[PDB]
Design a protein around this nucleic acid. Structure first.
Ligand code: MG
Ligand code: MG
Ligand code: MG
Ligand code: MG
Ligand code: MG
Ligand code: MG
Ligand code: MG
Ligand code: MG
Ligand code: MG
Ligand code: MG
Ligand code: MG
Ligand code: MG
Ligand code: MG
Ligand code: MG
Ligand code: MG
Ligand code: MG
Ligand code: MG
Ligand code: MG
Ligand code: MG
Ligand code: MG
Lengths: 62, 97, 87, 206, 129, 25, 217, 96, 117
RNA sequence: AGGGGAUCGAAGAUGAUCAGAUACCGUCGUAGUCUUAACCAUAAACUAUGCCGACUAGGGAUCGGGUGGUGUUUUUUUAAUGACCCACUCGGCACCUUACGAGAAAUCAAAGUCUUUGGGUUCUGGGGGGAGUAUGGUCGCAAGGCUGAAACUUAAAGGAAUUG
């Protein structure tokens, strides 16, 4: 092919993405603690559904 | 895939036979292949028998005939519609017209 | 199909062809059941009680449904001198 | 099983020689060869009446045993044998099938000819093949009129007539019915002939 | 040329049952054929066989009775150690609770059932189920 | 290109090579 | 309300036949999907796939949906419906009808010691549907249904406990795999083992016992 | 049947013939021609180390379009000149 | 070209099969009948129909037409299809026979009149 | 290499055609085409289907051999023998239907008797390119035949069938 192309714009995007700091939040439980926090959640109370029970939606349908 | 189960036309028990020259194409094609017709006619056609069977000597006579065994070939046996592309099954019909 | 304490499991026990004794398939819709009327003393046929053969998809399909029936007919005494074993 | 009365009687037999039922085709076919008696000079085949009779009897018997006598479909698309199967329908219950079979009868509900029988009789296994082939889709025994060259497929009990023509096709149908009446039903005294003619079963056109 | 005679025979037997036929003519009656036919007949997979004397090598007419799925040979007549007899039966028999592989041990031509009882092993002959 | 002529080609190459080489014995 | 046009339909609605096997034993061409609904409720459906396909109008294009349904109890009867129509939703249900009409029986069996209630298959069986050929093999307890998620599910509804597999061919064409898996389990009753070796004398066909009861209007 | 020899004595052929037909098996052949050692720019070894020569703007194949960032490398052990790809965004400035 | 569509014919075959002897070979009267025994949305169709079922008639009275049959004809075929002559078989001079068909009866256990060839 | 060189005709030449036309078409013609002695060893050298052995289904023509028929037709009187007819039956060249069975299908009496996987036996293939290439060897007067890689490269290449 052509092997000498433009090295000029080495790292465009990642050098021009708006800085935004990762927000603090309470640390999640670790170990057995966590895997409990899943069971008791992921299928004990259940939450929102669809007819298949969903996992990570946001805006939802509404 | 195979279009014709006889491939060309009858071999089976030979492997080769001497070829002939397509009567019109001036081509060349093995005798086992090649479309063939026996062209017999009258020397004086039909319309002319009047002037002929009349303006002669001899009682009635007896009209002569010509005997030309044509040898065509898939190239010019198709073009001269001596034969034609019969449908998938139709092709099988070895039956004379 | 027995078992441990001799109980009879196996939800169903297939008929069997009579010209080959090969299982009559659950979907063998060319297999069949002939029912021949058993008569009584002179003439009168008898509802309820008939003579019965059962032919297979395979036997019938191969045209052997006549010879095999006749073979089976004479045998159980339904015919006389129609089929001749030796040929 | 069957007593001494059911023996053939040359009263009957004569109608069979008269109707020329004994005349068979020039193609024997491997499966019909048991029915061959012997071969005529100048290529003809002589069938065996005592077998045709005996068959017919079994045929007649298999016609019986069948409870409801109206779901016994008797078929002929064939001309010659057509008039006969109307008559067989008259006498014993039997829904007949004259002329066209209309494919989709036995299989396919929705149709307005969904005969769902429990026995089929056929006049000629050739010209009534679609009838036979379709019957074998749905567990149905098949009585049938054979010649010597005949489709043995998916037919049980075959009655080797002539079916080529004349009156053989009528006679065998006539006698068939005649005997399924002498079998149970109402004829009785299987020794006495019938007020009913044979020419009641023949062709037409004229 | 003919090479197995046994396999040639069980072939016919097999082909016959399939096509709905309930009798076979076999060529040519060998002794190995016979014992094979025996061990078959015992367990019920065939009727009675009748040897024919040609002044030649023999013929056999065997009576069939449905119930035969496959008989068959395993050429070359392999060696079988006694703990490997299971490895075969496992390999080429429809189920644990029946069917038969027949061998040839120095005790004689038997099935693997019987061979297990006498505690002998030899060289594999064929199968039945 | 036609298998027949692509052969003729590769045959043509081979000879020229047979020649270019023996330009030094 | 159900109106049986079939002879077999009548006798089933009319309580004259109450079991499924009563139809298999006599080998009876089932036509109405309501029959097997009645004879066999508590049935279950699992929808296997919905894979849209395409072609042409006499110019441009045709495009519809293809659905695969297995139905089964978990006990010896199973069925397969493949139907494609102009809607997803409807060609699904369409199949659950063609699934039920296709219900076939299983001779489930023992791997060895016949200790109460079979855990596997009778014998080795095997099916084909072009290229794909699946093979079913009996198995010890605790083992399981060793098969591809599809086959297993079909063998679940089939109500199998333990079985080994050995599939060969383009296992990736779902429709063709399943059909031969079906073809396999539907062949268990096909195998004449020495259990069934005995002779019974042929039941008379319930289409003739309640014959008077059945027949047309 | 089956086209191979079945005999109880063809073990000679049976084994030798696979040793033949093993050679159409690619990896078998690479393993036994030691291509690993000979042809490869590494030794065969998992990794390898070298110095940077220049940097290349290798343009991507169809139907994409970009300028994949790459260096030319003088392999130390080998002397072999081989070009490698720098991955992730603007890392091509971490190397000179 | 005047080709009466199915909707016409499918009703001509339909009025004959129902109301036959209440019809006739005339056009005008049959046209009136349709107003009683049927319901037709347009005046022109009404006639178009009327004019076909009246076509059939004029050849019904000439020989039956393929797809069509009604009461008064259905037993008229049962009348013709009951003819039976003096007899045929019968026998007009013993039973004329061929060869071996004699051997067939000869080896059958039957009397029967005979004749050679 | 010699003989032979009617014909047809690679090369070439010429006339047209074409934007071009080294072509197709027209004409002229070398070698060649024939043969004898030597070479060459290759073709879609085709059934694109190894050989022997067994088995599984019907139908009819036709070739060769044999067999049976108080057959047909032949002398000037009907016997021989010639042909011709019919049935049989071996071994052929093929055809027909069929499909139990097989196949991805097209299709196949084998391409069947294979996940119920084993009669004997020779041969060849293992994604597509690179490539029948390079290299060694060898046979040939030569053209070439036989033997025959890798580096690197690539996600398709390919089969049968269907609808546009
Ligand atoms: Mg050739
Ligand atoms: Mg030639
Ligand atoms: Mg290219
Ligand atoms: Mg060349
Ligand atoms: Mg395969
Ligand atoms: Mg560079
Ligand atoms: Mg030139
Ligand atoms: Mg141009
Ligand atoms: Mg040039
Ligand atoms: Mg020389
Ligand atoms: Mg070659
Ligand atoms: Mg062979
Ligand atoms: Mg097919
Ligand atoms: Mg099978
Ligand atoms: Mg590979
Ligand atoms: Mg050259
Ligand atoms: Mg891509
Ligand atoms: Mg190709
Ligand atoms: Mg293609
Ligand atoms: Mg197309």
């Amino acid at each position: 092919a052509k092997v000498h192309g433009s090295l000029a714009r080495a790292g465009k995007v990642k050098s021009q993405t708006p800085k935004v700091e990762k927000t603090e939040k309470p640390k999640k439980p670790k170990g057995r603690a966590y895997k409990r926090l899943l069971y008791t959640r992921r299928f004990v109370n259940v939450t929102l559904v669809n007819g298949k029970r969903r996992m990570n939606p946001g805006p939802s349908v509404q | 895939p195979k279009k014709r189960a006889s491939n060309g036309r009858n071999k089976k028990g030979r492997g080769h036979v001497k070829p002939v020259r397509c009567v019109n194409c001036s081509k060349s094609i093995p005798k086992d292949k090649a479309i063939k017709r026996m062209a017999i006619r009258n020397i004086v056609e039909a319309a002319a028998v009047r002037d002929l069977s009349e303006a002669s000597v001899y009682p009635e006579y007896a009209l002569p005939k010509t005997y030309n065994k044509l040898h065509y070939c898939v190239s010019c046996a198709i073009h001269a519609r001596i034969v034609r592309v019969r449908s998938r099954e139709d092709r099988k019909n070895r039956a004379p017209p | 199909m027995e078992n441990d304490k001799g109980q009879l499991v196996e939800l169903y026990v297939p008929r069997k062809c009579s010209a080959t004794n090969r299982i009559i398939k659950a979907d063998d819709h060319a297999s069949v059941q002939i029912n021949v009327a058993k008569v009584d003393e002179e003439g009168r046929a008898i509802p309820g009680e008939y003579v019965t053969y059962a032919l297979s998809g395979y036997v019938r399909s191969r045209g052997e449904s006549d010879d095999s029936l006749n073979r089976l007919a004479q045998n159980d005494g339904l015919l006389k001198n129609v089929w001749s074993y030796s040929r | 099983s069957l007593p001494a009365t059911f023996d053939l009687t040359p009263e009957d037999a004569q109608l069979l020689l008269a109707a020329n039922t004994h005349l068979g085709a020039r193609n024997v076919q491997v499966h019909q060869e048991p029915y061959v008696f012997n071969a005529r000079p100048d290529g003809v085949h002589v069938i065996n009446v005592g077998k045709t009779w005996e068959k017919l009897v079994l045929a007649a018997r298999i016609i019986a045993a069948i409870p409801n006598p109206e779901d016994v479909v008797a078929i002929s698309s064939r001309t010659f044998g057509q008039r006969a199967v109307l008559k067989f329908a008259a006498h014993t219950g039997a829904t007949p099938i004259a002329g066209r079979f209309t494919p989709g009868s036995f299989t396919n509900y929705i149709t307005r000819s969904f005969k769902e029988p429990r026995l089929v009789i056929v006049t000629d296994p050739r010209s009534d093949a679609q009838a036979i082939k379709e019957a074998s889709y749905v567990n149905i025994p098949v009585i049938a009129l054979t010649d010597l060259d005949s489709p043995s497929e998916f037919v049980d009990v075959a009655i080797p007539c002539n079916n080529r023509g004349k009156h053989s096709i009528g006679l065998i149908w006539y006698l068939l019915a005649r005997e399924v009446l002498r079998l149970r039903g109402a004829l009785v005294d299987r020794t006495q002939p019938w007020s009913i003619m044979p020419d009641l079963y023949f062709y037409r056109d004229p | 040329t003919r090479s197995s005679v046994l396999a040639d025979a069980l072939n016919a037997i097999n082909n016959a049952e399939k096509t709905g036929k309930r009798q076979v003519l076999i060529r040519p009656s060998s002794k190995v054929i016979i014992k094979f036919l025996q061990v078959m007949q015992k367990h019920g997979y065939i009727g009675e066989f009748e040897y024919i004397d040609d002044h030649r090598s023999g013929k056999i007419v065997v009576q069939l009775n449905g119930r035969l799925n496959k008989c068959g040979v395993i050429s070359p007549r392999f060696n079988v150690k006694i703990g490997d007899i299971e490895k075969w039966t496992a390999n080429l028999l429809p189920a644990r609770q029946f069917g038969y592989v027949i061998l040839t041990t120095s005790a004689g031509i038997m099935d693997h059932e019987e061979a297990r009882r006498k505690h002998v092993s030899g060289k594999i002959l064929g199968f039945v189920y | 290109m036609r298998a027949k002529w692509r052969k003729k080609r590769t045959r043509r190459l081979k000879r020229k090579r047979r020649k270019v080489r023996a330009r030094s014995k | 309300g159900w109106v049986p046009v079939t002879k077999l339909g009548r006798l089933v609605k009319a309580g004259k036949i109450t079991t499924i096997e009563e139809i298999f034993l006599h080998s009876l061409p089932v036509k109405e999907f309501q029959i097997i609904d009645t004879l066999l409720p508590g049935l279950q459906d699992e929808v296997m796939n919905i894979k849209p396909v395409q072609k042409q109008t006499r110019a441009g294009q045709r495009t519809r949906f293809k659905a695969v349904v297995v139905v089964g109890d978990s006990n010896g009867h199973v069925g397969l419906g493949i139907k494609t129509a102009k809607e997803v939703a409807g060609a699904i249900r369409a199949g659950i009808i063609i699934a039920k009409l296709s219900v076939i029986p299983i001779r489930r069996g023992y791997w060895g010691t016949n200790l109460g209630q079979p855990h596997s298959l009778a014998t080795k069986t095997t099916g084909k549907c072009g290229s794909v050929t699946v093979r079913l093999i009996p198995a010890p307890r605790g083992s399981g249904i060793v098969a591809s998620p599809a086959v297993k599910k079909l063998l679940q509804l089939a109500g199998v406990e333990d079985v080994y597999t050995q599939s060969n061919g383009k296992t990736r064409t779902l429709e063709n795999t399943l059909k031969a898996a079906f073809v396999a389990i539907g062949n268990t009753y096909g195998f004449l083992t020495p259990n069934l070796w005995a002779e019974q004398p042929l039941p008379v066909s319930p289409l003739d016992i309640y014959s008077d009861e059945a027949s047309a209007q | 049947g089956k086209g191979k020899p079945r005999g109880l004595n063809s073990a000679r052929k049976l084994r030798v013939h696979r040793r033949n037909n093993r050679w159409a098996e690619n990896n078998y052949k690479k393993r036994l021609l030691g291509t690993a050692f000979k042809s490869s720019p590494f030794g065969g070894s998992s990794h390898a180390k070298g110095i940077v020569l220049e940097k290349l703007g290798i343009e991507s194949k169809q139907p994409n379009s970009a300028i994949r960032k790459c260096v030319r490398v003088q392999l130390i052990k080998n002397g072999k000149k081989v070009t490698a790809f720098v991955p992730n965004d603007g890392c091509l400035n971490f190397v000179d | 070209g005047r080709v009466r569509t199915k909707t016409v014919k499918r009703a001509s075959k339909a009025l004959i099969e129902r109301y036959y002897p209440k019809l006739t070979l005339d056009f005008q009267t049959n046209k009136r009948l349709c107003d009683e025994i049927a319901t037709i949305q347009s005046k022109r169709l009404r006639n178009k129909i009327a004019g076909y079922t009246t076509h059939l008639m004029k050849r019904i009275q000439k020989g039956p037409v393929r797809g069509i049959s009604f009461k008064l004809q259905e037993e008229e075929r049962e009348r013709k299809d009951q003819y039976v002559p003096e007899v045929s078989a019968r026998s007009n001079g013993v039973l004329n026979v061929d060869n071996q068909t004699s051997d067939l009866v000869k080896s059958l256990g039957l009397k029967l009149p005979l004749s050679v060839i």
